[PDB]
Amino acid sequence: MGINTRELFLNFTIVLITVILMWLLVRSYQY
């Protein structure tokens, strides 16, 4: 982790797109 931004979005941005799609994309409207 040195001189290379956007290198941890996977865990972060996924847990965020997963959390969201969950509360609402799991209900009855997939992504």
Side-chain angles (χ1 to χ4, degrees):
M1 300 180 60
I3 301 300
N4 60 179
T5 305
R6 185 177 63 286
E7 50 61 294
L8 181 59
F9 63 68
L10 64 178
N11 181 300
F12 189 4
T13 302
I14 293 178
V15 178
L16 296 181
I17 171 289
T18 191
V19 71
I20 179 290
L21 67 75
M22 181 180 180
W23 183 59
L24 53 289
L25 295 180
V26 176
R27 178 59 60 180
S28 299
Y29 299 119
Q30 58 63 60
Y31 184 3

PDB file of all heavy atoms in Angstrom:
ATOM      1  N   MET A   1       0.839  -1.227   0.000  1.00  0.00           N
ATOM      2  CA  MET A   1       0.000   0.000   0.000  1.00  0.00           C
ATOM      3  C   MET A   1       0.861   1.259   0.000  1.00  0.00           C
ATOM      4  O   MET A   1       0.989   1.938   1.020  1.00  0.00           O
ATOM      5  CB  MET A   1      -0.900  -0.027   1.237  1.00  0.00           C
ATOM      6  CG  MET A   1      -1.827  -1.230   1.289  1.00  0.00           C
ATOM      7  SD  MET A   1      -2.884  -1.231   2.750  1.00  0.00           S
ATOM      8  CE  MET A   1      -3.776   0.307   2.525  1.00  0.00           C
ATOM      9  N   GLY A   2       1.454   1.565  -1.151  1.00  0.00           N
ATOM     10  CA  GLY A   2       2.296   2.742  -1.262  1.00  0.00           C
ATOM     11  C   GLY A   2       2.270   3.346  -2.653  1.00  0.00           C
ATOM     12  O   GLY A   2       2.722   2.724  -3.614  1.00  0.00           O
ATOM     13  N   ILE A   3       1.738   4.560  -2.760  1.00  0.00           N
ATOM     14  CA  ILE A   3       1.654   5.247  -4.044  1.00  0.00           C
ATOM     15  C   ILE A   3       0.806   4.450  -5.030  1.00  0.00           C
ATOM     16  O   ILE A   3       1.292   4.006  -6.071  1.00  0.00           O
ATOM     17  CB  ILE A   3       3.056   5.485  -4.645  1.00  0.00           C
ATOM     18  CG1 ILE A   3       3.909   6.317  -3.685  1.00  0.00           C
ATOM     19  CG2 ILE A   3       2.951   6.178  -5.998  1.00  0.00           C
ATOM     20  CD1 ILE A   3       3.320   7.677  -3.377  1.00  0.00           C
ATOM     21  N   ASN A   4      -0.467   4.272  -4.695  1.00  0.00           N
ATOM     22  CA  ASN A   4      -1.383   3.529  -5.549  1.00  0.00           C
ATOM     23  C   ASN A   4      -2.811   3.581  -5.010  1.00  0.00           C
ATOM     24  O   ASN A   4      -3.354   2.571  -4.564  1.00  0.00           O
ATOM     25  CB  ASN A   4      -0.923   2.073  -5.690  1.00  0.00           C
ATOM     26  CG  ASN A   4      -0.854   1.301  -4.373  1.00  0.00           C
ATOM     27  OD1 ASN A   4      -0.510   0.118  -4.369  1.00  0.00           O
ATOM     28  ND2 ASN A   4      -1.168   1.944  -3.248  1.00  0.00           N
ATOM     29  N   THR A   5      -3.414   4.765  -5.058  1.00  0.00           N
ATOM     30  CA  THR A   5      -4.781   4.950  -4.578  1.00  0.00           C
ATOM     31  C   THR A   5      -5.711   3.930  -5.233  1.00  0.00           C
ATOM     32  O   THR A   5      -5.298   3.187  -6.123  1.00  0.00           O
ATOM     33  CB  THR A   5      -5.253   6.375  -4.886  1.00  0.00           C
ATOM     34  OG1 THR A   5      -4.358   7.325  -4.339  1.00  0.00           O
ATOM     35  CG2 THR A   5      -6.628   6.694  -4.342  1.00  0.00           C
ATOM     36  N   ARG A   6      -6.966   3.900  -4.798  1.00  0.00           N
ATOM     37  CA  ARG A   6      -7.945   2.977  -5.353  1.00  0.00           C
ATOM     38  C   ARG A   6      -7.392   1.550  -5.394  1.00  0.00           C
ATOM     39  O   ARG A   6      -7.311   0.934  -6.455  1.00  0.00           O
ATOM     40  CB  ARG A   6      -8.336   3.446  -6.752  1.00  0.00           C
ATOM     41  CG  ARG A   6      -9.439   2.630  -7.391  1.00  0.00           C
ATOM     42  CD  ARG A   6      -9.847   3.181  -8.749  1.00  0.00           C
ATOM     43  NE  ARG A   6      -8.765   3.135  -9.737  1.00  0.00           N
ATOM     44  CZ  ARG A   6      -7.714   3.954  -9.741  1.00  0.00           C
ATOM     45  NH1 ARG A   6      -7.694   5.029  -8.964  1.00  0.00           N
ATOM     46  NH2 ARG A   6      -6.708   3.734 -10.577  1.00  0.00           N
ATOM     47  N   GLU A   7      -7.009   1.036  -4.226  1.00  0.00           N
ATOM     48  CA  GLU A   7      -6.461  -0.315  -4.125  1.00  0.00           C
ATOM     49  C   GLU A   7      -7.115  -1.122  -3.001  1.00  0.00           C
ATOM     50  O   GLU A   7      -6.685  -2.235  -2.695  1.00  0.00           O
ATOM     51  CB  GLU A   7      -4.937  -0.265  -3.953  1.00  0.00           C
ATOM     52  CG  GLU A   7      -4.438   0.667  -2.849  1.00  0.00           C
ATOM     53  CD  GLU A   7      -4.939   0.308  -1.463  1.00  0.00           C
ATOM     54  OE1 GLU A   7      -6.157   0.409  -1.222  1.00  0.00           O
ATOM     55  OE2 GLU A   7      -4.106  -0.075  -0.614  1.00  0.00           O
ATOM     56  N   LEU A   8      -8.160  -0.563  -2.399  1.00  0.00           N
ATOM     57  CA  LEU A   8      -8.884  -1.234  -1.321  1.00  0.00           C
ATOM     58  C   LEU A   8     -10.393  -1.044  -1.496  1.00  0.00           C
ATOM     59  O   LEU A   8     -11.185  -1.336  -0.596  1.00  0.00           O
ATOM     60  CB  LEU A   8      -8.432  -0.689   0.039  1.00  0.00           C
ATOM     61  CG  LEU A   8      -9.101  -1.328   1.259  1.00  0.00           C
ATOM     62  CD1 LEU A   8      -8.844  -2.826   1.286  1.00  0.00           C
ATOM     63  CD2 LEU A   8      -8.597  -0.678   2.539  1.00  0.00           C
ATOM     64  N   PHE A   9     -10.783  -0.550  -2.668  1.00  0.00           N
ATOM     65  CA  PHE A   9     -12.181  -0.311  -2.974  1.00  0.00           C
ATOM     66  C   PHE A   9     -12.962  -1.613  -3.027  1.00  0.00           C
ATOM     67  O   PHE A   9     -14.156  -1.648  -2.748  1.00  0.00           O
ATOM     68  CB  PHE A   9     -12.297   0.435  -4.307  1.00  0.00           C
ATOM     69  CG  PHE A   9     -11.779  -0.346  -5.485  1.00  0.00           C
ATOM     70  CD1 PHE A   9     -12.433  -1.487  -5.927  1.00  0.00           C
ATOM     71  CD2 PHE A   9     -10.627   0.055  -6.141  1.00  0.00           C
ATOM     72  CE1 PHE A   9     -11.949  -2.208  -7.003  1.00  0.00           C
ATOM     73  CE2 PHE A   9     -10.140  -0.661  -7.217  1.00  0.00           C
ATOM     74  CZ  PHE A   9     -10.801  -1.793  -7.648  1.00  0.00           C
ATOM     75  N   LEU A  10     -12.279  -2.677  -3.401  1.00  0.00           N
ATOM     76  CA  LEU A  10     -12.913  -3.986  -3.511  1.00  0.00           C
ATOM     77  C   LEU A  10     -13.640  -4.363  -2.219  1.00  0.00           C
ATOM     78  O   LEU A  10     -14.843  -4.606  -2.226  1.00  0.00           O
ATOM     79  CB  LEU A  10     -11.897  -5.076  -3.897  1.00  0.00           C
ATOM     80  CG  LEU A  10     -10.780  -5.376  -2.887  1.00  0.00           C
ATOM     81  CD1 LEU A  10      -9.896  -6.500  -3.400  1.00  0.00           C
ATOM     82  CD2 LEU A  10      -9.939  -4.139  -2.606  1.00  0.00           C
ATOM     83  N   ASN A  11     -12.917  -4.409  -1.112  1.00  0.00           N
ATOM     84  CA  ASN A  11     -13.520  -4.764   0.165  1.00  0.00           C
ATOM     85  C   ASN A  11     -14.510  -3.699   0.627  1.00  0.00           C
ATOM     86  O   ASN A  11     -15.590  -4.018   1.118  1.00  0.00           O
ATOM     87  CB  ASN A  11     -12.434  -4.964   1.225  1.00  0.00           C
ATOM     88  CG  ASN A  11     -13.006  -5.357   2.574  1.00  0.00           C
ATOM     89  OD1 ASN A  11     -13.793  -4.620   3.166  1.00  0.00           O
ATOM     90  ND2 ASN A  11     -12.610  -6.526   3.067  1.00  0.00           N
ATOM     91  N   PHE A  12     -14.131  -2.436   0.487  1.00  0.00           N
ATOM     92  CA  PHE A  12     -14.985  -1.336   0.920  1.00  0.00           C
ATOM     93  C   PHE A  12     -16.207  -1.169   0.010  1.00  0.00           C
ATOM     94  O   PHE A  12     -17.351  -1.287   0.455  1.00  0.00           O
ATOM     95  CB  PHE A  12     -14.171  -0.038   0.945  1.00  0.00           C
ATOM     96  CG  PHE A  12     -14.877   1.140   1.567  1.00  0.00           C
ATOM     97  CD1 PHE A  12     -16.132   1.006   2.145  1.00  0.00           C
ATOM     98  CD2 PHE A  12     -14.268   2.386   1.587  1.00  0.00           C
ATOM     99  CE1 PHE A  12     -16.763   2.090   2.724  1.00  0.00           C
ATOM    100  CE2 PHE A  12     -14.895   3.472   2.167  1.00  0.00           C
ATOM    101  CZ  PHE A  12     -16.144   3.324   2.735  1.00  0.00           C
ATOM    102  N   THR A  13     -15.953  -0.866  -1.257  1.00  0.00           N
ATOM    103  CA  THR A  13     -17.019  -0.641  -2.234  1.00  0.00           C
ATOM    104  C   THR A  13     -17.930  -1.856  -2.427  1.00  0.00           C
ATOM    105  O   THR A  13     -19.052  -1.708  -2.905  1.00  0.00           O
ATOM    106  CB  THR A  13     -16.421  -0.232  -3.584  1.00  0.00           C
ATOM    107  OG1 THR A  13     -15.635   0.938  -3.449  1.00  0.00           O
ATOM    108  CG2 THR A  13     -17.466   0.043  -4.645  1.00  0.00           C
ATOM    109  N   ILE A  14     -17.470  -3.048  -2.056  1.00  0.00           N
ATOM    110  CA  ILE A  14     -18.288  -4.250  -2.210  1.00  0.00           C
ATOM    111  C   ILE A  14     -19.204  -4.429  -1.021  1.00  0.00           C
ATOM    112  O   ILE A  14     -20.382  -4.754  -1.165  1.00  0.00           O
ATOM    113  CB  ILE A  14     -17.445  -5.513  -2.438  1.00  0.00           C
ATOM    114  CG1 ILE A  14     -16.743  -5.439  -3.797  1.00  0.00           C
ATOM    115  CG2 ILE A  14     -18.306  -6.768  -2.351  1.00  0.00           C
ATOM    116  CD1 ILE A  14     -15.845  -6.623  -4.082  1.00  0.00           C
ATOM    117  N   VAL A  15     -18.662  -4.176   0.146  1.00  0.00           N
ATOM    118  CA  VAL A  15     -19.437  -4.262   1.369  1.00  0.00           C
ATOM    119  C   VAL A  15     -20.524  -3.199   1.356  1.00  0.00           C
ATOM    120  O   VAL A  15     -21.525  -3.298   2.067  1.00  0.00           O
ATOM    121  CB  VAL A  15     -18.555  -4.036   2.600  1.00  0.00           C
ATOM    122  CG1 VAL A  15     -19.385  -4.082   3.878  1.00  0.00           C
ATOM    123  CG2 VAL A  15     -17.433  -5.060   2.654  1.00  0.00           C
ATOM    124  N   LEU A  16     -20.307  -2.176   0.542  1.00  0.00           N
ATOM    125  CA  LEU A  16     -21.262  -1.083   0.430  1.00  0.00           C
ATOM    126  C   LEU A  16     -22.305  -1.355  -0.646  1.00  0.00           C
ATOM    127  O   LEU A  16     -23.472  -0.989  -0.492  1.00  0.00           O
ATOM    128  CB  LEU A  16     -20.559   0.244   0.141  1.00  0.00           C
ATOM    129  CG  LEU A  16     -19.620   0.741   1.239  1.00  0.00           C
ATOM    130  CD1 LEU A  16     -18.999   2.071   0.838  1.00  0.00           C
ATOM    131  CD2 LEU A  16     -20.367   0.873   2.557  1.00  0.00           C
ATOM    132  N   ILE A  17     -21.907  -2.019  -1.724  1.00  0.00           N
ATOM    133  CA  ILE A  17     -22.835  -2.343  -2.766  1.00  0.00           C
ATOM    134  C   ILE A  17     -23.589  -3.606  -2.372  1.00  0.00           C
ATOM    135  O   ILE A  17     -24.684  -3.874  -2.865  1.00  0.00           O
ATOM    136  CB  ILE A  17     -22.118  -2.465  -4.144  1.00  0.00           C
ATOM    137  CG1 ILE A  17     -23.049  -3.019  -5.217  1.00  0.00           C
ATOM    138  CG2 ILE A  17     -20.875  -3.339  -4.038  1.00  0.00           C
ATOM    139  CD1 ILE A  17     -23.349  -4.476  -5.005  1.00  0.00           C
ATOM    140  N   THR A  18     -23.007  -4.356  -1.435  1.00  0.00           N
ATOM    141  CA  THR A  18     -23.639  -5.576  -0.941  1.00  0.00           C
ATOM    142  C   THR A  18     -24.680  -5.227   0.120  1.00  0.00           C
ATOM    143  O   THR A  18     -25.780  -5.780   0.136  1.00  0.00           O
ATOM    144  CB  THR A  18     -22.604  -6.538  -0.342  1.00  0.00           C
ATOM    145  OG1 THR A  18     -23.181  -7.810  -0.109  1.00  0.00           O
ATOM    146  CG2 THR A  18     -22.051  -6.068   0.980  1.00  0.00           C
ATOM    147  N   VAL A  19     -24.317  -4.301   1.009  1.00  0.00           N
ATOM    148  CA  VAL A  19     -25.210  -3.876   2.078  1.00  0.00           C
ATOM    149  C   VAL A  19     -26.471  -3.272   1.491  1.00  0.00           C
ATOM    150  O   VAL A  19     -27.590  -3.598   1.887  1.00  0.00           O
ATOM    151  CB  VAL A  19     -24.529  -2.833   2.995  1.00  0.00           C
ATOM    152  CG1 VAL A  19     -24.351  -1.485   2.313  1.00  0.00           C
ATOM    153  CG2 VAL A  19     -25.280  -2.692   4.309  1.00  0.00           C
ATOM    154  N   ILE A  20     -26.258  -2.380   0.544  1.00  0.00           N
ATOM    155  CA  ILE A  20     -27.350  -1.689  -0.128  1.00  0.00           C
ATOM    156  C   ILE A  20     -28.264  -2.668  -0.873  1.00  0.00           C
ATOM    157  O   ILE A  20     -29.452  -2.766  -0.567  1.00  0.00           O
ATOM    158  CB  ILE A  20     -26.806  -0.589  -1.081  1.00  0.00           C
ATOM    159  CG1 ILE A  20     -27.934   0.140  -1.828  1.00  0.00           C
ATOM    160  CG2 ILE A  20     -25.812  -1.175  -2.070  1.00  0.00           C
ATOM    161  CD1 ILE A  20     -28.639  -0.698  -2.874  1.00  0.00           C
ATOM    162  N   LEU A  21     -27.724  -3.396  -1.847  1.00  0.00           N
ATOM    163  CA  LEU A  21     -28.535  -4.345  -2.609  1.00  0.00           C
ATOM    164  C   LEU A  21     -29.266  -5.308  -1.682  1.00  0.00           C
ATOM    165  O   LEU A  21     -30.274  -5.901  -2.052  1.00  0.00           O
ATOM    166  CB  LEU A  21     -27.669  -5.130  -3.588  1.00  0.00           C
ATOM    167  CG  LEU A  21     -26.695  -6.055  -2.906  1.00  0.00           C
ATOM    168  CD1 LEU A  21     -27.396  -7.287  -2.346  1.00  0.00           C
ATOM    169  CD2 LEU A  21     -25.552  -6.442  -3.833  1.00  0.00           C
ATOM    170  N   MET A  22     -28.747  -5.480  -0.482  1.00  0.00           N
ATOM    171  CA  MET A  22     -29.364  -6.389   0.462  1.00  0.00           C
ATOM    172  C   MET A  22     -30.705  -5.856   0.955  1.00  0.00           C
ATOM    173  O   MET A  22     -31.756  -6.459   0.714  1.00  0.00           O
ATOM    174  CB  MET A  22     -28.435  -6.635   1.653  1.00  0.00           C
ATOM    175  CG  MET A  22     -29.009  -7.597   2.681  1.00  0.00           C
ATOM    176  SD  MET A  22     -27.899  -7.870   4.076  1.00  0.00           S
ATOM    177  CE  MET A  22     -28.867  -9.010   5.060  1.00  0.00           C
ATOM    178  N   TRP A  23     -30.643  -4.727   1.656  1.00  0.00           N
ATOM    179  CA  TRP A  23     -31.811  -4.094   2.235  1.00  0.00           C
ATOM    180  C   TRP A  23     -32.873  -3.795   1.209  1.00  0.00           C
ATOM    181  O   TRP A  23     -34.046  -3.655   1.559  1.00  0.00           O
ATOM    182  CB  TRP A  23     -31.411  -2.815   2.974  1.00  0.00           C
ATOM    183  CG  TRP A  23     -32.557  -2.143   3.669  1.00  0.00           C
ATOM    184  CD1 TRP A  23     -33.353  -2.678   4.641  1.00  0.00           C
ATOM    185  CD2 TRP A  23     -33.029  -0.809   3.452  1.00  0.00           C
ATOM    186  NE1 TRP A  23     -34.294  -1.759   5.038  1.00  0.00           N
ATOM    187  CE2 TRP A  23     -34.115  -0.604   4.324  1.00  0.00           C
ATOM    188  CE3 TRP A  23     -32.638   0.230   2.606  1.00  0.00           C
ATOM    189  CZ2 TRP A  23     -34.815   0.600   4.370  1.00  0.00           C
ATOM    190  CZ3 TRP A  23     -33.332   1.425   2.653  1.00  0.00           C
ATOM    191  CH2 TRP A  23     -34.409   1.601   3.530  1.00  0.00           C
ATOM    192  N   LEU A  24     -32.492  -3.702  -0.056  1.00  0.00           N
ATOM    193  CA  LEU A  24     -33.494  -3.424  -1.069  1.00  0.00           C
ATOM    194  C   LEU A  24     -33.402  -4.284  -2.332  1.00  0.00           C
ATOM    195  O   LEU A  24     -34.438  -4.570  -2.933  1.00  0.00           O
ATOM    196  CB  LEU A  24     -33.596  -1.928  -1.421  1.00  0.00           C
ATOM    197  CG  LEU A  24     -32.306  -1.201  -1.808  1.00  0.00           C
ATOM    198  CD1 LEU A  24     -31.396  -1.022  -0.601  1.00  0.00           C
ATOM    199  CD2 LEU A  24     -31.591  -1.945  -2.921  1.00  0.00           C
ATOM    200  N   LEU A  25     -32.214  -4.717  -2.757  1.00  0.00           N
ATOM    201  CA  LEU A  25     -32.157  -5.548  -3.960  1.00  0.00           C
ATOM    202  C   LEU A  25     -32.503  -7.002  -3.648  1.00  0.00           C
ATOM    203  O   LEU A  25     -32.763  -7.786  -4.562  1.00  0.00           O
ATOM    204  CB  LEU A  25     -30.810  -5.449  -4.682  1.00  0.00           C
ATOM    205  CG  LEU A  25     -30.480  -4.071  -5.266  1.00  0.00           C
ATOM    206  CD1 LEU A  25     -29.129  -4.091  -5.966  1.00  0.00           C
ATOM    207  CD2 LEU A  25     -31.570  -3.626  -6.229  1.00  0.00           C
ATOM    208  N   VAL A  26     -32.540  -7.363  -2.364  1.00  0.00           N
ATOM    209  CA  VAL A  26     -32.896  -8.722  -1.984  1.00  0.00           C
ATOM    210  C   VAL A  26     -34.401  -8.855  -1.820  1.00  0.00           C
ATOM    211  O   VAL A  26     -34.977  -9.916  -2.064  1.00  0.00           O
ATOM    212  CB  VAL A  26     -32.200  -9.169  -0.687  1.00  0.00           C
ATOM    213  CG1 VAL A  26     -32.668 -10.557  -0.272  1.00  0.00           C
ATOM    214  CG2 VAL A  26     -30.693  -9.156  -0.867  1.00  0.00           C
ATOM    215  N   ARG A  27     -35.025  -7.764  -1.410  1.00  0.00           N
ATOM    216  CA  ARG A  27     -36.474  -7.726  -1.209  1.00  0.00           C
ATOM    217  C   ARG A  27     -37.207  -8.403  -2.366  1.00  0.00           C
ATOM    218  O   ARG A  27     -37.738  -9.503  -2.216  1.00  0.00           O
ATOM    219  CB  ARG A  27     -36.950  -6.278  -1.060  1.00  0.00           C
ATOM    220  CG  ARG A  27     -38.456  -6.141  -0.899  1.00  0.00           C
ATOM    221  CD  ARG A  27     -38.964  -6.900   0.317  1.00  0.00           C
ATOM    222  NE  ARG A  27     -38.361  -6.418   1.558  1.00  0.00           N
ATOM    223  CZ  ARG A  27     -38.640  -6.919   2.759  1.00  0.00           C
ATOM    224  NH1 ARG A  27     -39.514  -7.910   2.885  1.00  0.00           N
ATOM    225  NH2 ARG A  27     -38.046  -6.428   3.838  1.00  0.00           N
ATOM    226  N   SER A  28     -37.228  -7.741  -3.520  1.00  0.00           N
ATOM    227  CA  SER A  28     -37.892  -8.281  -4.701  1.00  0.00           C
ATOM    228  C   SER A  28     -37.500  -7.504  -5.954  1.00  0.00           C
ATOM    229  O   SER A  28     -38.301  -7.351  -6.876  1.00  0.00           O
ATOM    230  CB  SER A  28     -39.411  -8.245  -4.523  1.00  0.00           C
ATOM    231  OG  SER A  28     -39.817  -9.025  -3.412  1.00  0.00           O
ATOM    232  N   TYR A  29     -36.263  -7.018  -5.982  1.00  0.00           N
ATOM    233  CA  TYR A  29     -35.760  -6.257  -7.122  1.00  0.00           C
ATOM    234  C   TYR A  29     -34.241  -6.360  -7.214  1.00  0.00           C
ATOM    235  O   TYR A  29     -33.524  -5.462  -6.775  1.00  0.00           O
ATOM    236  CB  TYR A  29     -36.166  -4.785  -7.007  1.00  0.00           C
ATOM    237  CG  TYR A  29     -37.661  -4.555  -7.000  1.00  0.00           C
ATOM    238  CD1 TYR A  29     -38.284  -3.957  -5.912  1.00  0.00           C
ATOM    239  CD2 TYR A  29     -38.448  -4.930  -8.081  1.00  0.00           C
ATOM    240  CE1 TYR A  29     -39.649  -3.740  -5.901  1.00  0.00           C
ATOM    241  CE2 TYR A  29     -39.813  -4.714  -8.079  1.00  0.00           C
ATOM    242  CZ  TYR A  29     -40.408  -4.120  -6.986  1.00  0.00           C
ATOM    243  OH  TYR A  29     -41.767  -3.904  -6.981  1.00  0.00           O
ATOM    244  N   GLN A  30     -33.755  -7.456  -7.788  1.00  0.00           N
ATOM    245  CA  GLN A  30     -32.318  -7.667  -7.934  1.00  0.00           C
ATOM    246  C   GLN A  30     -31.663  -6.491  -8.653  1.00  0.00           C
ATOM    247  O   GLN A  30     -32.348  -5.645  -9.229  1.00  0.00           O
ATOM    248  CB  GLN A  30     -32.041  -8.977  -8.684  1.00  0.00           C
ATOM    249  CG  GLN A  30     -32.665  -9.048 -10.073  1.00  0.00           C
ATOM    250  CD  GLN A  30     -32.121  -7.999 -11.025  1.00  0.00           C
ATOM    251  OE1 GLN A  30     -30.924  -7.962 -11.310  1.00  0.00           O
ATOM    252  NE2 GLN A  30     -33.001  -7.136 -11.521  1.00  0.00           N
ATOM    253  N   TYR A  31     -30.335  -6.440  -8.617  1.00  0.00           N
ATOM    254  CA  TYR A  31     -29.597  -5.363  -9.268  1.00  0.00           C
ATOM    255  C   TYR A  31     -29.801  -5.414 -10.779  1.00  0.00           C
ATOM    256  O   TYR A  31     -30.635  -4.637 -11.290  1.00  0.00           O
ATOM    257  CB  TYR A  31     -28.104  -5.466  -8.935  1.00  0.00           C
ATOM    258  CG  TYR A  31     -27.254  -4.335  -9.488  1.00  0.00           C
ATOM    259  CD1 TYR A  31     -27.819  -3.270 -10.185  1.00  0.00           C
ATOM    260  CD2 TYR A  31     -25.877  -4.334  -9.301  1.00  0.00           C
ATOM    261  CE1 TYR A  31     -27.035  -2.243 -10.679  1.00  0.00           C
ATOM    262  CE2 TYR A  31     -25.089  -3.310  -9.791  1.00  0.00           C
ATOM    263  CZ  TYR A  31     -25.673  -2.268 -10.479  1.00  0.00           C
ATOM    264  OH  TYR A  31     -24.890  -1.247 -10.967  1.00  0.00           O
TER     265      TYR A  31
END
